Symmetry: C2
Subunit: 100 residues, 2 copies
């Protein structure tokens, strides 16, 4: 038995773009600020559910944030050593805050 149908394969684009920001840790706040139209993103440490340095690419890390919808922010640090510093700092701020 044999039927043929006209169909479309749906395929997403795989390229990953990278838009420069400044990530600042200011007491218990994290700010994602563009350098010199994008508006500044202000996170409180209490909002961060996850912060993890990539097991694949040393310069990559992500911060998952509750603000039913978790925002997932993936980032690239200037270097693997900076990546470790940002992730460590944020993991320490989160430990410290969560202690209470």
């Amino acid at each position: 038995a044999y039927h043929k149908y006209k169909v479309w394969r749906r395929q997403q684009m795989s390229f990953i773009n990278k838009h420069e920001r400044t990530l600042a840790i200011d007491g218990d706040y994290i700010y994602i600020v563009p350098p010199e139209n994008v508006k500044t993103k202000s996170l409180h440490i209490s909002q961060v559910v996850l912060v993890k340095k990539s097991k694949r690419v040393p310069e990559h890390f992500k911060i998952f944030v509750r603000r039913d919808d978790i925002k997932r922010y993936y980032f690239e640090a200037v270097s693997g050593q900076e990546c470790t510093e940002i992730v460590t700092r944020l993991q320490n701020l989160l430990s410290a805050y969560r202690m209470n």
Copy 2:
């Protein structure tokens, strides 16, 4: 306490492209053939782990296929009624085959 870091937000492109194919059901084989460089994809019904009509868009459906890596083929039928026919047909072929 206050540190600022130069970082990149990593963002994937969200657009979904759609590349025409012909999907043919030929006994227990499904072929994904381009119409008139792409090579024909030949699936046996035993390879299909899932085939489901979208709950969001009537013309959409997907076929998940084992060939540790499952291929996920998302498609758009010419119409919602054709979508239902393709999905029904494939679900029936899978029932029939799996009966053994």
